Motif scaffolding. Structure first.
Motif, short mmCIF file in Angstrom:
data_model
loop_
_atom_site.label_atom_id
_atom_site.label_comp_id
_atom_site.label_asym_id
_atom_site.label_seq_id
_atom_site.Cartn_x
_atom_site.Cartn_y
_atom_site.Cartn_z
N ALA A 92 40.78 41.84 53.71
CA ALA A 92 39.31 42.07 53.90
C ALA A 92 38.63 43.30 53.44
O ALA A 92 37.84 43.50 52.76
CB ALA A 92 39.01 41.94 55.36
N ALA A 99 35.80 43.82 50.50
CA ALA A 99 34.69 44.64 51.00
C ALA A 99 34.72 45.72 49.84
O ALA A 99 33.56 45.70 49.15
CB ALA A 99 34.88 45.48 52.19
N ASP A 112 33.27 43.82 46.30
CA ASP A 112 32.07 43.67 46.65
C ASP A 112 30.73 44.43 46.07
O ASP A 112 29.76 44.47 45.85
CB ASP A 112 31.49 43.02 47.92
N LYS A 129 38.66 37.64 49.07
CA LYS A 129 37.62 36.92 49.69
C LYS A 129 38.17 35.60 50.32
O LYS A 129 37.95 35.22 51.19
CB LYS A 129 36.21 36.95 49.20
N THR A 148 38.27 34.24 54.04
CA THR A 148 37.67 33.36 54.56
C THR A 148 38.40 32.22 55.28
O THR A 148 38.08 31.49 56.34
CB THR A 148 36.76 32.70 53.40
N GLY A 196 38.61 37.44 58.84
CA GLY A 196 37.87 38.21 57.90
C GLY A 196 36.31 37.98 58.09
O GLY A 196 35.55 38.42 57.27
N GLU A 231 34.89 41.10 58.05
CA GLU A 231 33.66 41.08 56.99
C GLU A 231 32.57 41.84 57.70
O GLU A 231 31.93 42.58 57.14
CB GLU A 231 33.75 39.65 56.44
#
Length: 275
Positions: free
Chosen positions: A10, A14, A17, A29, A33, A38, A42
């Motif tokens: 996670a 982050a 991104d 990611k 998911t 996460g 997240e």
């Protein structure tokens, strides 16, 4: 998949991104998911906020360090890689590997099955020759690695990220002994050590983290062998870079997090060459 493997993936997602990303893991990611923790990771005062920024930055810096280690091994001609307790690590997929490279991942079978199937559902398969070795590392893992095609006479780059602090102190010695027995001259290893005085940190990190949602090293051992010292008397040339020193080097150290002045609250990144 353990809670820790999810959390660190996670963190990588982050980092990835952000426009100013230090590392980019296009697969992280996807991988968090499809567990569901996460969503929380997240999603998730000064000390509390500094703790979340530290989690992300530590993982970015750690990822960058081990990525660089593998990249430099590739440059140096090494073509056999072993990722120990590979969890949700996507290096076999995302790093550039020359033709003829083999990359072994050793972990429990459910973890490996989760990662490969999750990636498949997204149309992701590796380009490199990735080889799974489904076994627990506290058991007799060398025959399993050998049966997967591992050549002990070839130079190997080994990686042991986020592992030792979750293994009993006696298990660490046995692990390194087995690695030495499988390692040709010119092999290398990079490992994240267990912090010298570092169970307290997870509690003030747990506490600060638990206020973020609202909105433990059970094996910590005073007698655990110092890693660089142990390798240096068992056939390696080993040196250490403290995680805070590494974070400072790339301008990612936040001294606002509690226990910042205690270098003993943090891992070292040890790199060693087989003699």
């Amino acid at each position: 998949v353990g809670t820790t493997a999810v959390m660190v993936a996670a963190a990588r997602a982050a980092e990835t991104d952000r426009p100013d990303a230090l590392i980019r893991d296009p697969y992280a990611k996807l991988l968090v998911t499809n567990t569901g923790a996460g969503a929380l990771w997240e999603a998730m005062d000064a000390e509390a906020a500094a703790m979340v920024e530290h989690m992300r930055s530590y993982q970015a810096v750690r990822t960058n360090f081990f990525d660089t280690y593998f990249n430099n091994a590739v440059i140096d001609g090494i073509r056999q890689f072993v990722i120990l307790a590979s969890g949700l690590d996507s290096r076999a997929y995302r790093l550039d590997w020359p033709t003829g490279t083999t990359v072994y991942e050793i972990d429990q079978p459910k973890v490996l099955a989760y990662k490969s199937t999750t990636l498949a559902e997204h149309g992701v398969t590796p380009t490199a020759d990735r080889r799974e070795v489904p076994i627990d590392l506290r058991q007799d893992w060398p025959p399993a690695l050998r049966s997967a095609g591992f050549d002990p006479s070839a130079r190997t780059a080994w990686l042991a990220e986020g592992l030792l602090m979750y293994l009993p102190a006696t298990a660490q010695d046995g692990l390194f002994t087995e690695i030495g027995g499988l390692s040709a001259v010119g092999s290398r290893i990079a490992v994240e050590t267990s912090p010298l005085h570092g169970d307290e940190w997870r509690e003030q990190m747990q506490l600060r983290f638990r206020r973020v949602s609202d909105a433990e090293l059970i094996y910590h051992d005073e007698n655990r062998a110092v890693v660089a010292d142990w390798l240096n008397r068992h056939g390696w040339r080993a040196t250490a870079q403290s995680a805070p020193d590494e974070m400072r080097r790339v301008g990612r150290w936040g001294d606002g997090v509690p226990m910042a002045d205690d270098k003993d609250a943090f891992a070292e990144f040890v790199t060693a060459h087989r003699l």
